[PDB]
């Protein structure tokens, strides 16, 4: 009979598997087992009797451990029996690490009892305050903080001190666990509620550094991410506890050194805090400065008002330029009026581009449409460099719409330079058919057309301000990452198959003269030389994705049936792989990404729209192009703000603690430790009655 | 060693983080802590003893607050201990806002005790009746309503009174919270069960206005949506409690001022109420008036009966026209017979359109097929204007099938007018090859063909009456919204790339004469001038989505390789972006939308089919075209209906309250407040026994 030779033992090596305690320990004796059972049942009577008997005769080890690791004190703590715990403490049982067990079980009375005076379930670095913060119990954390406890200060991510490197080399696991435990203690909402001068600010900073740690710490990434999410949720709930608009303005306008704290939240990407309904209500109130009742207005009225303000944008800009203090001078200063004016200016620029789209002069002078376009381009460039000067270099490069604006402005500058070069180096009127391939006019036209495409695509950034197009834009932005990830391997496969096809087909490259219409390449009516060169092969394989490459391009002029079949088989394999596998894989990745983002789409859109709104709150950059390039003719107070913020924060912390306790109390589902402790109370009552009677 | 300089403190600024109570409060003394612990443990003995000791010696503040905010009265309420609460009340403890805590914990005895005679967890606007309605406890709500309590009347959404605007400017957060709390109290199913003359009607109106508020209130939208859903669910459950058909007819036929209440439910879009199984059973009984056993019939029998009635539709219409009172005169009056006759008439119209589809006369007289079609068109127009006259203008424009009917009828009218114009302004027989581009006959034919397309697509509305095609039609209708949302940005990208391509390629526009077949555009065998004009560029980029635009259209006649490559690169970028990114994004959005609608697809289909059925219940509009344009030869009772409806509503409310209490009682999952109160009972029993013994 064939058997499993070795499953649990090696040297034992017939039809049975004998079982033994391989890692045998020290078993409890009869009296020790009886004493521990009496402690478990909670009868004070025989527990006390056995304690006195062991004191007198030394027959029983009162520090005996249940083979599972629990002692009499640990059992009493687990049973939440304060009387038996007091009795054991008065008999001087071993109290080592029992405070940690009491903290974890969250017995306030046990914590006070142990504060008033081997194997462990906790790592050696765990301290009572650290574990109390981990449990997030406000009572125990406060009780421990009333005594002078400290939390070791974590080092920076890029720290390279002797202590950090020595600890990492000696024990990387212990160092990582200690860092994670320290950050878990620090990120405790109850510990941030206490012991923190600015809980909101601390949460913002803690979430940011925890996200950075999750980035750097490739392992243990989920723990740091959930700690950062906990900090963000704590900040959002603190903002939720606000009960009046005055408190909200105090919170949001507070400067640690208007809406300073909201700008700090935006800097740390606290999307949940920013997307809070009250903060969004205040932001909408500031946004619709001119219209107090824009929210309750019919869509036709809103559309008519928007069109009227857009048509009136030049007059508003001129009024601001001449007299900033008037009925119309400061009208454009309103954030929504400013947004409408800027949108109208950009739409006018795009309309002028379209009109420009509406012949044999080398380097012709710019037309009236180009002359009108030029101030808009200069205004865009000046606004770009002004954003660089004001917001700084780091802030500008973070935005990708800023990258698109830089590309578009560089293309416009190149177009202007090429037009100037063509004007100054060309005077005659030569027909375009005989122009050079790299003629300056042709390159200028190409760059202008690409700039027009980019300028018209820049309108997608305005989708953020809309309730319907906003989350759509967010979804496209999120799935562009999957687009890039799939595009990497699409380009790899494209390069592989292009290399193969070109290696096969470069022997049959033909001159353009031999072609029916003197046309060489796949952009001809009769496609030819599709895989003659590597660049043409890449273009052909790209165009095969859309079916624009005909099948006869795999046929050579000679009667090489085997070579033509091999090329057609490479082409078919590329079609299969790329189209079916890669495109449908991309569809699946985008589907899953869409399901992931749909839960958080609203908060992301609100954060992006808040950024867009605060972009229009500042005094600078009010004039849209081309009016931004027109030279215009032109402590005790801190302490009281700090005191008001501190009072508001105290009220918020009290409300948050009460709400969190209420949420914990009203959570459906009881664990069996409550059942065992209820059993303990009932059994103690039964035995006490029996002793009395 | 690099450290995190400031995490919890700013000015403290080495390797540790000292912890202190930054927002320090007043700690409880020893005797106050002991008294509160005695209250928590529920021992009446030392609680009473400490109360008397504080009364005599003033050593203990009986109003001392646990640093978490709970006082002795609050702890007693949380422990559900009525004896200790009575003892505290007899000793005149502070009772402020304790009624709210008792209401929230839903202790009926505590509520009666407090009715019989700082920091808070409730907002200042919360009133006992409001919080009782929020908790949806029928007992406490009834107890508070027996005393003369009031709920502040909410203002309208578009209200612009001095009070509303002053409250919004002074405190927008408080005003919004107060409005939400008032509507939460009003939308309470238990409070609607009481205090409401017509609970069903109140629920319909409350859900409607809560949905309107969710629309207007962009923030706090989820709360208003869930309140409206709660009102709809309450109405649906009230309809569920019906136990007999007589009660159902009493409910549905009740007029507040047949099936009046069902029409009111349809007006408020109470889809769950309408899709109730008993209401649908009654609607099916009314729908199959002629056939008492249509439900239990073989599919072949149903198909044969439907075909027979459809073939017999002209005779039924003529019989109704001549003698409305006969065996066949009122047969078409039945809703299902009427539906079959109308479907047969429309199918005959479509068959005649197809026959019309089955040559050199300018403005020819209409053929026999067109002469037969004309009465159908006149009937459709007359039915449209009759729906305008009867149902009103607002009701008509809400339907989108009504918009399609308007477009189709306008196209038919334009076709008739153009045919008349061509007949009266053209007599000779000129070959069609030399006709003008805008010849009236050609435009009339084009409009007639578009009208035929619209008329044949109108059949999709009939999918609602089918069990399989109904939810499919609902799903298509739901995803058309995503179609439009994606089409917005598709058109934006299309305009951007069309602008770029036209700006690049408009220099190479060629005359049609220079083309091989005198054909200019992409609708030619050899496509050319694809990006010469903006409209042609838009058409070319549209047709590139389906692969119908060949690649050689990016080649210019001249040898401008750089320009051709730039144009081909714009074309490839447009293909990539539009097809891959945008189409697959649309696929993902439609997938997610389908998952969202699949849960509610059945209710939506039932509501739509109910609307279709009640469209055939009315006396008017019985004759289908072309028979609708043939001129035919032609209180005490309210009080008893109100009393019957009131009795039925009383029975329904009693049943609903009993069912909701049963549902609450049989919900799996106990929260830990029950565990703590069980501990309180056990501990009170233990201490009472100890005191006795
Ligand atoms: C040699 C001849 C070549 C001829 C080529 C002609 C055709 C050129 C057409 C270029 C079109 C590029 C594609 C633009 C698609 C924009 C889609 C934006 C969607 C979106 O909402 O993303 C936002 C950011 O936008 C952004 O990320 C910015 C979008 C644009 C960035 C890249 C700009 C490339 C410019 C190329 C110039 C080529 C010049 C050639 C001479 C989100 O924003 P978020 O911040 O939340 O981010 C969240 C990231 N998940
Ligand atoms: C210049 C030459 C032009 C030549 C053009 C020739 C081709 C024209 C073809 C037009 C076809 C338009 C597309 C019709 C698709 C109908 C799909 C209906 C699906 C559906 O069930 O939606 C129902 C409502 O129907 C509806 O919403 C109504 C559908 C139709 C509304 C739009 C009608 C457009 C008419 C265009 C006329 C053009 C004339 C040009 C001279 C749901 O119903 P619900 O109420 O539950 O809604 C729920 C909303 N989620
Ligand atoms: C799609 C084709 C026909 C080209 C049309 C180009 C523009 C005329 C469209 C494309 C995107 C549209 C924009 C999409 C996003 C918004 C944000 C939207 O913001 C609001 O909803 C106002 C309320 C607020 O945010 O304070 C205002 C309209 C606007 C500028 C739209 C104005 C009209 C735009 C510029
Ligand atoms: C698909 C091609 C062959 C063109 C055929 C056109 C018509 C002959 C088809 C297309 C849609 C069909 C309709 C789809 C929906 C319905 C609702 C359906 O309603 C029922 O199930 C009867 C029970 C009831 O609702 O009371 C009756 C058949 C009918 C009119 C179908 C009749 C036959 C129709 C008109
Ligand atoms: C759009 C532009 C960047 C393209 C489009 C080509 O232009 C032409 O071919 C004119 O002759 C060109 C020159 O530049 C390159 C040749 C090979 C390939 C890398 C092409 C590039 O295309 C993609 O980068 C990826 C496309 C893709 C993505 C997802 C699914 C399927 C395809
Ligand atoms: C790629 C290569 C293995 C192919 C591609 C053909 O080469 C050509 O035709 C040149 O003339 C060839 C010879 O060898 C076979 C002919 C019939 C079929 C089996 C083809 C094979 O293709 C697939 O095995 C499956 C393709 C597929 C997969 C998913 C969805 C759709 C299609
Ligand atoms: Ca910019
Ligand atoms: Ca109609
Ligand atoms: Zn270090
Ligand atoms: Zn008002």
Short mmCIF file of C-alpha atoms in Angstrom, two decimals, chain A residues 412-575:
data_model
loop_
_atom_site.label_atom_id
_atom_site.label_comp_id
_atom_site.label_asym_id
_atom_site.label_seq_id
_atom_site.Cartn_x
_atom_site.Cartn_y
_atom_site.Cartn_z
CA UNK A 412 3.13 79.48 -30.90
CA UNK A 413 6.52 81.12 -30.27
CA UNK A 414 8.15 78.79 -32.80
CA UNK A 415 5.40 79.62 -35.31
CA UNK A 416 5.97 83.36 -34.81
CA UNK A 417 9.73 82.96 -35.17
CA UNK A 418 9.37 80.85 -38.32
CA UNK A 419 6.93 83.36 -39.82
CA UNK A 420 9.41 86.17 -39.13
CA UNK A 421 12.26 84.14 -40.65
CA UNK A 422 10.20 83.36 -43.76
CA UNK A 423 9.18 87.02 -44.09
CA UNK A 424 12.77 88.28 -43.83
CA UNK A 425 14.42 85.54 -45.95
CA UNK A 426 11.76 85.26 -48.69
CA UNK A 427 10.27 87.99 -50.88
CA UNK A 428 9.14 86.47 -54.18
CA UNK A 429 5.94 84.59 -54.96
CA UNK A 430 6.94 81.03 -55.90
CA UNK A 431 4.18 78.44 -56.38
CA UNK A 432 3.84 76.13 -53.39
CA UNK A 433 4.30 72.97 -55.49
CA UNK A 434 8.03 73.68 -55.89
CA UNK A 435 8.70 74.75 -52.30
CA UNK A 436 11.32 72.93 -50.25
CA UNK A 437 10.15 70.15 -47.94
CA UNK A 438 11.50 72.07 -44.92
CA UNK A 439 10.33 75.46 -46.17
CA UNK A 440 9.86 77.84 -43.20
CA UNK A 441 6.27 78.66 -44.21
CA UNK A 442 5.27 74.98 -44.27
CA UNK A 443 6.83 74.28 -40.87
CA UNK A 444 5.21 77.42 -39.44
CA UNK A 445 1.82 76.29 -40.75
CA UNK A 446 2.30 72.80 -39.28
CA UNK A 447 3.28 74.19 -35.88
CA UNK A 448 0.35 76.62 -35.97
CA UNK A 449 -2.05 73.76 -36.72
CA UNK A 450 -0.65 71.67 -33.85
CA UNK A 451 -0.97 74.72 -31.59
CA UNK A 452 -4.59 75.11 -32.70
CA UNK A 453 -5.25 71.47 -31.80
CA UNK A 454 -3.68 71.95 -28.36
CA UNK A 455 -5.53 75.22 -27.75
CA UNK A 456 -8.88 73.67 -28.64
CA UNK A 457 -8.14 70.63 -26.46
CA UNK A 458 -7.32 72.98 -23.57
CA UNK A 459 -11.10 73.45 -23.16
CA UNK A 460 -11.25 70.06 -21.39
CA UNK A 461 -9.84 71.69 -18.24
CA UNK A 462 -13.01 73.81 -18.07
CA UNK A 463 -15.08 70.63 -17.63
CA UNK A 464 -14.15 70.72 -13.93
CA UNK A 465 -16.49 73.64 -13.22
CA UNK A 466 -19.50 71.64 -14.46
CA UNK A 467 -21.40 69.12 -12.36
CA UNK A 468 -21.78 66.60 -15.20
CA UNK A 469 -18.53 67.04 -17.14
CA UNK A 470 -16.39 67.27 -14.00
CA UNK A 471 -16.43 63.66 -12.80
CA UNK A 472 -16.20 62.62 -16.46
CA UNK A 473 -12.96 64.58 -16.79
CA UNK A 474 -11.73 63.03 -13.54
CA UNK A 475 -12.50 59.55 -14.89
CA UNK A 476 -10.62 60.22 -18.14
CA UNK A 477 -7.67 61.53 -16.13
CA UNK A 478 -7.62 58.40 -13.97
CA UNK A 479 -7.82 56.04 -16.94
CA UNK A 480 -5.05 57.86 -18.84
CA UNK A 481 -2.67 56.14 -16.40
CA UNK A 482 -3.91 52.76 -17.63
CA UNK A 483 -3.60 54.13 -21.17
CA UNK A 484 0.10 54.81 -20.55
CA UNK A 485 0.70 51.49 -18.79
CA UNK A 486 -0.82 49.57 -21.70
CA UNK A 487 0.92 51.83 -24.23
CA UNK A 488 4.32 50.78 -22.87
CA UNK A 489 3.81 47.14 -23.81
CA UNK A 490 1.91 48.11 -26.97
CA UNK A 491 5.03 49.98 -28.08
CA UNK A 492 7.20 47.01 -27.08
CA UNK A 493 5.12 44.60 -29.20
CA UNK A 494 5.01 47.17 -32.01
CA UNK A 495 8.81 47.44 -31.99
CA UNK A 496 9.21 43.65 -31.96
CA UNK A 497 6.89 43.05 -34.91
CA UNK A 498 8.22 46.08 -36.81
CA UNK A 499 11.76 44.74 -36.40
CA UNK A 500 10.67 41.34 -37.71
CA UNK A 501 8.65 42.69 -40.64
CA UNK A 502 11.35 45.17 -41.68
CA UNK A 503 14.04 42.48 -41.42
CA UNK A 504 11.92 40.34 -43.75
CA UNK A 505 10.85 43.03 -46.22
CA UNK A 506 13.79 45.44 -46.52
CA UNK A 507 15.25 43.43 -49.43
CA UNK A 508 12.26 44.39 -51.61
CA UNK A 509 12.39 48.16 -51.08
CA UNK A 510 11.52 49.87 -54.37
CA UNK A 511 12.22 53.36 -55.67
CA UNK A 512 9.33 55.83 -55.81
CA UNK A 513 9.85 56.15 -59.57
CA UNK A 514 8.86 52.50 -60.09
CA UNK A 515 5.54 53.15 -58.33
CA UNK A 516 2.40 53.73 -60.44
CA UNK A 517 1.97 57.35 -59.31
CA UNK A 518 5.57 58.08 -58.19
CA UNK A 519 4.25 57.65 -54.64
CA UNK A 520 6.17 55.60 -52.06
CA UNK A 521 4.67 54.58 -48.73
CA UNK A 522 1.29 53.70 -47.25
CA UNK A 523 -0.16 57.22 -47.64
CA UNK A 524 -0.66 56.49 -51.35
CA UNK A 525 -3.79 55.29 -53.14
CA UNK A 526 -2.00 52.01 -53.92
CA UNK A 527 -0.08 51.30 -50.72
CA UNK A 528 3.47 50.05 -51.23
CA UNK A 529 6.80 49.70 -49.42
CA UNK A 530 4.94 49.28 -46.13
CA UNK A 531 7.81 47.41 -44.44
CA UNK A 532 10.76 48.66 -46.50
CA UNK A 533 12.14 50.88 -43.72
CA UNK A 534 11.75 50.73 -39.95
CA UNK A 535 9.87 54.03 -39.62
CA UNK A 536 7.49 53.07 -42.43
CA UNK A 537 7.04 49.66 -40.80
CA UNK A 538 6.13 51.35 -37.51
CA UNK A 539 3.62 53.60 -39.28
CA UNK A 540 2.12 50.63 -41.15
CA UNK A 541 1.74 48.57 -37.98
CA UNK A 542 0.18 51.57 -36.23
CA UNK A 543 -2.30 52.06 -39.07
CA UNK A 544 -3.15 48.35 -39.16
CA UNK A 545 -4.82 48.83 -35.75
CA UNK A 546 -7.50 50.95 -37.45
CA UNK A 547 -7.70 48.79 -40.57
CA UNK A 548 -6.17 51.48 -42.80
CA UNK A 549 -3.36 49.20 -44.03
CA UNK A 550 -4.45 47.00 -46.93
CA UNK A 551 -3.53 43.32 -47.08
CA UNK A 552 -1.67 43.49 -50.41
CA UNK A 553 1.21 45.36 -48.73
CA UNK A 554 2.49 41.93 -47.63
CA UNK A 555 3.06 40.98 -51.28
CA UNK A 556 6.44 41.55 -52.93
CA UNK A 557 6.98 42.22 -56.63
CA UNK A 558 8.89 38.96 -57.10
CA UNK A 559 7.26 35.53 -56.94
CA UNK A 560 8.45 34.77 -53.40
CA UNK A 561 5.36 32.99 -52.11
CA UNK A 562 7.08 31.71 -48.96
CA UNK A 563 8.40 35.17 -48.04
CA UNK A 564 5.02 36.78 -48.72
CA UNK A 565 3.27 34.13 -46.61
CA UNK A 566 5.74 34.61 -43.75
CA UNK A 567 5.21 38.37 -43.87
CA UNK A 568 1.43 37.96 -43.95
CA UNK A 569 1.69 35.56 -41.00
CA UNK A 570 3.71 38.09 -39.00
CA UNK A 571 1.14 40.73 -39.94
CA UNK A 572 -1.72 38.47 -38.84
CA UNK A 573 0.01 37.57 -35.58
CA UNK A 574 0.57 41.27 -34.89
CA UNK A 575 -3.08 42.00 -35.70
#
